[PDB]
Design a protein around this nucleic acid. Structure first.
Ligand SMILES: Nc1nc2c(ncn2[C@@H]2O[C@H](COP(=O)(O)OP(=O)(O)OP(=O)(O)O)[C@@H](O)[C@H]2O)c(=O)[nH]1
Ligand SMILES: [Mg+2]
Ligand SMILES: [Mg+2]
Ligand SMILES: [Mg+2]
Ligand SMILES: [Mg+2]
Ligand SMILES: [Mg+2]
Ligand SMILES: [Mg+2]
Ligand SMILES: [Mg+2]
Ligand SMILES: [Mg+2]
Ligand SMILES: [Mg+2]
Ligand SMILES: [Mg+2]
Ligand SMILES: [Mg+2]
Ligand SMILES: [Mg+2]
Ligand SMILES: [Mg+2]
Ligand SMILES: [Mg+2]
Ligand SMILES: [Mg+2]
Ligand SMILES: [Mg+2]
Ligand SMILES: [Mg+2]
Ligand SMILES: [Mg+2]
Ligand SMILES: [Mg+2]
Ligand SMILES: [Mg+2]
Ligand SMILES: [Mg+2]
Ligand SMILES: [Mg+2]
Ligand SMILES: [Mg+2]
Ligand SMILES: [Mg+2]
Ligand SMILES: [Mg+2]
Ligand SMILES: [Mg+2]
Ligand SMILES: [Mg+2]
Ligand SMILES: [Mg+2]
Ligand SMILES: [Mg+2]
Ligand SMILES: [Mg+2]
Ligand SMILES: [Mg+2]
Ligand SMILES: [Mg+2]
Ligand SMILES: [Mg+2]
Ligand SMILES: [Mg+2]
Ligand SMILES: [Mg+2]
Ligand SMILES: [Mg+2]
Ligand SMILES: [Mg+2]
Ligand SMILES: [Mg+2]
Ligand SMILES: [Zn+2]
Lengths: 236, 108, 19
RNA sequence: GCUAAACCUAGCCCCAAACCCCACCUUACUACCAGACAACCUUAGCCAAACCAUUUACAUAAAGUAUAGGCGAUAGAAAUUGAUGGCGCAAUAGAUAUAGUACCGCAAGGGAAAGAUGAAAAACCAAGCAUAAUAUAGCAAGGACUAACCCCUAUACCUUCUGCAUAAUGAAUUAACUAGAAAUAACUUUGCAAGGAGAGCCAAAGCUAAGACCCCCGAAACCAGACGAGCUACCUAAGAACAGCUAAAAGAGCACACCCGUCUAUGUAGCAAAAUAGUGGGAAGAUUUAUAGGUAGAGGCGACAAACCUA
RNA sequence: CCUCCGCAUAAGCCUGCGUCAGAUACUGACAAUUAACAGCCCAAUAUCUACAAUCAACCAACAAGUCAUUAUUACCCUCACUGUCAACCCAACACAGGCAUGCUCAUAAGGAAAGGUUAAAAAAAGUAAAAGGAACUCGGCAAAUCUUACCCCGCCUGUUUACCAAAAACAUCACCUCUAGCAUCACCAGUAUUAGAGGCACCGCCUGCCCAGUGACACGUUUAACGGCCGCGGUACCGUGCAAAGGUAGCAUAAUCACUUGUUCCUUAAAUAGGGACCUGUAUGAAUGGCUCCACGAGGGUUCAGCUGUCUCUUACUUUUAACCAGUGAAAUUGACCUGCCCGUGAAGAGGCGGGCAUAACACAGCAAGACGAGAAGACCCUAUGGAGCUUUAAUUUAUUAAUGCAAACACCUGCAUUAAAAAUUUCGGUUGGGGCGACCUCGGAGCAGAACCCAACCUCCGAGCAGUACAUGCUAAGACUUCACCAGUCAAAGCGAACCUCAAUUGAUCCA
């Protein structure tokens, strides 16, 4: 096939980017994932998951102003247009994030624990134990990859050594270098879990094609499986 | 239903040469005393009828020329006058159709 | 199973001939 | 006496010898702009083994020997030896070929037919019918007879079968075409003869040579490589359509266009290789639909109907 | 008189009803469609571009949306090329089909249902119909009217076998199970309130017990995984066995094996129908989801009332068809036919044969009893050491992936093993009172088969797949028998060497080990 990924943009921007649906088809053209196809046309809004990204020629902790909080078609959680210095950028909005709020992004790990305030980004080592976090990075400077869905909140359990233990929303524990940044509070759109589709048409709008009509026998995997919680996933 | 066997040429000849199939000789043909062409007794002579039809066509073309358009039928009688002929007292008050030829002998 | 035998068209040249 | 009949050369087959202006990869046949992308990788299967599973061929002589082999079907060496046309075709033949054209298919691809005067054109015969329809009764004829019929006798053919007039198969009919290939061992006839044969091989009358016996059409299939998503299944890009009324931001109701195809009738070689008329379901949505692109057969796609993927 | 239309653009086609001349909407020649409409575009490098649309204004949103530049550097000096026709395309055709868009919404544009006659049957379309009003029929199919109420299934809108099934099947919101801690080609430019693999099916009440077995996960757990959820003795409850638990709630003659038309009440004059019930199911039953229920359905039943030609019971008329006249002109089929009826016969249903009867010749229009009529080398059934699809817990494999372990190298790659996943190749014996099921398949004895031999049966009856004794139960060798072939199986003189086999069957080749 001649499939070329629409994700060719190289420069970050605030403008919604015109996407191209895949319908679950790989670059070879064959279906790789079923149940995807159609739905309302959407435009991608480039999200800056590296919350501590000091502006060019600048460094150190910096503040920003929340211009607005906007529904994002590409994400369960709604996003926020956060502007600082002479730049703007899309970020993941926390639960109680309103327009006009001030958001602090710092890389400083003080000897004491910073007073956690919802919406700000601090290194995990700077947070008090037990604070609710989101948009956690696997490695320092990698960028947020975990706890990004609507209403998801990780927990800061321990800060042994130069490492921090994070309870992910799936309850799995995660060891990360304390220098990696994570935002305070739970992700916005907390009531996303209580959304009623109502009609098959709404699923088709969202872009989920109906399940296959073929009847499958349920094997040994089907029965409820109670397992011990998996061990910590370490990144040190 | 389809034929169970081919019908022979003998049977076919019987069927298609049975006198019911054959054309019947017509004994009602006769010579027209006027022109001498053949005509069926009850039917009008083809030659004479064609003469009359052609003269009628000429007269009707003159009628159309005089009328000059559709829906202009006269409200008076019509008389056809040929070369060398003048309207009579009866012809007075009637639309005159002039034909540029001698009156046919059969026409009166 | 459904049985269908597609019609077979005779070549056009056979019937297109002219004096 | 009409359809028609014929015809001889266009060419072809097998051998020998010999080695063989401009435009055009973009939507080919399109004068004229920054590329970068580059090829190599065991054939398989049918089939035989009466299945199928290891397996199953792709000069002479040694020799069908050594060997291999579900040691079986079958496979099978080497050393060594020495090494100038036609008892062809002649227009259903011979090349498919007058031409890879016409035509058919989206494409890969399939694939025809035929012509006949003469030195000069600046010169009686197939079927089918008609001449000429038919006379009681009968496998259509035979014995006959003065006499066509009338009289008497007579259950078409082929194949298949225990057995067929069989109401079992095939056949309208004419013309043309259309189907028994060969080893071993024997037999017959020659030649020579304990030897024969123009190296090799055989031999306790054999050896050498010749003659003479082994068909045609037909599957569903299997595998390899191409070609196909202009139909249809689904998807991608960017478009278009949805009157009117009730209701009110509705996978809402009635209802056009539009999409579909519930039931009836007709049609069933049809207008149509799935239609027509009426009737009916939806008709602002999970809708319908124009354009271009994508997924390819050990596959794709599928609101699974084993659906659809050029009837 | 009709008008579905029609006129343009798109797409498609490619000169395909313009003129002249010849023929007999054809052939040859000549001519033609003129760009403004449309196509054919853009110099770079960076840098910008949160705020739909819907009369965009209130409003209401969700499915979150077609519409934008700047900065510097370059640069004008010189309107080409191509489509333009038509009665047109895809359907083998001048095919009643397919065919996007803008206007026209019945037309200003575009067309002609009747070749002529007659007015037979049968057939098609339509209209009208006395009295009755479903008495028709499987069924109110069709037609006519506009019409109530109760059930089953599915919640619903949707989807499906293009070309016999539109459904109760598939999907479906909702609920639930399982898997996954993660980024530069899908999932996803997403991150556990996410994504994927599934089951069931909105909602309401619920979803009972069981982990013994299989599977899966773990190093015991799991059933909203595959699945399962009882007896005995005594006279419902009193004791006992067994099991993992003994089917719980609910519903129940069900779309639920049979009994079946279950038994009753209602409904009808009459009901194998329908509805309501039952000590109604050892073959009901709970996300293999159970009950209830609002709406909805061309789904399947039943029904009030009306309606009507469905019918009692058919009739009349118009059109088409039809028949006749004219033109043009197929198809399957066809051994030949000089092609009768009755009875009998026969390859077990005669036009053709035997005995009777009948019998001038041919047309035309109807009919469908026969020509075992045409049509498709029957799709039913069997067979073939003929296929293919699918499933596996059929045989053979792991070449291929995924894991591991061992080497090799210092995670990857390579080689070797093991385990899974996925697959691949191939087969699915025979006899048989058709096939299947059952039984049988080899050997011996007795009858059938009385007397040389031999004789079938899914015929009648018995048995065998050893055992015992001996260790010359060694070696050789004439001649014979022979299970109707061969293979195999038998007996045996003489001789050497010695001493001084029983038994009816009591078994199995080759290759290969
Ligand atoms: N067997 C055979 N002989 C041929 C063939 N063609 C040609 N010849 C022979 O060639 C010889 C010479 O032919 P010519 O035509 O007379 O002479 P050429 O042209 O010098 O001959 P080539 O060198 O063979 O071309 C004659 O003996 C021919 O018969 C062929 O096809 N087969
Ligand atoms: Mg399902
Ligand atoms: Mg074989
Ligand atoms: Mg064979
Ligand atoms: Mg050699
Ligand atoms: Mg030829
Ligand atoms: Mg003749
Ligand atoms: Mg007969
Ligand atoms: Mg016969
Ligand atoms: Mg037969
Ligand atoms: Mg026949
Ligand atoms: Mg397409
Ligand atoms: Mg509307
Ligand atoms: Mg609606
Ligand atoms: Mg099914
Ligand atoms: Mg099926
Ligand atoms: Mg007409
Ligand atoms: Mg007529
Ligand atoms: Mg009446
Ligand atoms: Mg009745
Ligand atoms: Mg009634
Ligand atoms: Mg009745
Ligand atoms: Mg009806
Ligand atoms: Mg439904
Ligand atoms: Mg529906
Ligand atoms: Mg579909
Ligand atoms: Mg169908
Ligand atoms: Mg359909
Ligand atoms: Mg249907
Ligand atoms: Mg269902
Ligand atoms: Mg009834
Ligand atoms: Mg006629
Ligand atoms: Mg009889
Ligand atoms: Mg007749
Ligand atoms: Mg019959
Ligand atoms: Mg028949
Ligand atoms: Mg047959
Ligand atoms: Mg076989
Ligand atoms: Mg013997
Ligand atoms: Zn006259």
């Amino acid at each position: 096939a001649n499939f070329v990924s629409w994700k060719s943009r190289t420069k970050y921007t605030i403008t919604p980017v015109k996407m191209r649906k895949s319908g679950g088809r790989d670059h070879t053209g064959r279906i790789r994932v079923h149940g995807i196809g159609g739905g309302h046309k959407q435009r991608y809004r480039m999200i800056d998951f590296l919350r501590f990204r000091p502006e060019e020629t600048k460094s150190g902790p910096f503040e920003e102003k929340v211009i607005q909080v906007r529904y994002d078609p590409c994400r369960s959680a709604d996003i926020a247009l956060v502007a600082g210095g002479s730049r703007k950028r899309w970020i993941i909005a926390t639960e109680n994030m309103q327009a006009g709020d001030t958001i602090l992004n710092s890389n400083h790990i003080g000897r004491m624990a910073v007073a956690a305030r919802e919406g700000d980004a601090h290194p995990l080592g700077a947070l008090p134990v037990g604070t609710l976090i989101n948009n956690v990075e696997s490695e320092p400077g990698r960028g947020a990859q975990y706890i990004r869905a609507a209403g998801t909140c990780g927990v800061l359990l321990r800060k042994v050594n130069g490492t921090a233990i994070i309870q992910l929303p799936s309850k799995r524990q995660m060891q990360v270098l304390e220098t990696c940044v994570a935002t305070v509070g739970r992700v916005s759109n907390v009531d996303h879990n209580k959304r009623v589709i109502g009609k098959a048409g709404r699923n088709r709008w969202l872009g989920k094609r109906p399940n296959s009509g073929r009847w499958h026998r349920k094997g040994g995997w089907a029965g409820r499986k109670i397992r011990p919680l998996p061990p910590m996933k370490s990144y040190v | 239903a389809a034929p169970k066997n081919r019908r022979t040429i003998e049977v076919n000849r019987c069927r298609r040469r049975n006198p019911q199939k054959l054309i019947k000789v017509k004994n009602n043909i006769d010579v027209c005393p006027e022109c001498g062409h053949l005509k069926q007794k009850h039917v009008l002579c083809a030659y004479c009828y064609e003469k009359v039809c052609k003269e009628t066509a000429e007269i009707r073309r003159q009628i159309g020329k005089q009328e000059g358009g559709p829906f202009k039928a006269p409200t008076i009688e019509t008389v056809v006058l040929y070369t060398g002929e003048t309207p009579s007292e009866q012809d007075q008050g009637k639309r005159i159709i002039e034909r540029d030829r001698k009156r046919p002998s059969w026409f009166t | 199973k459904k049985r269908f035998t597609p019609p077979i068209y005779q070549p056009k040249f056979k019937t297109e001939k002219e004096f």
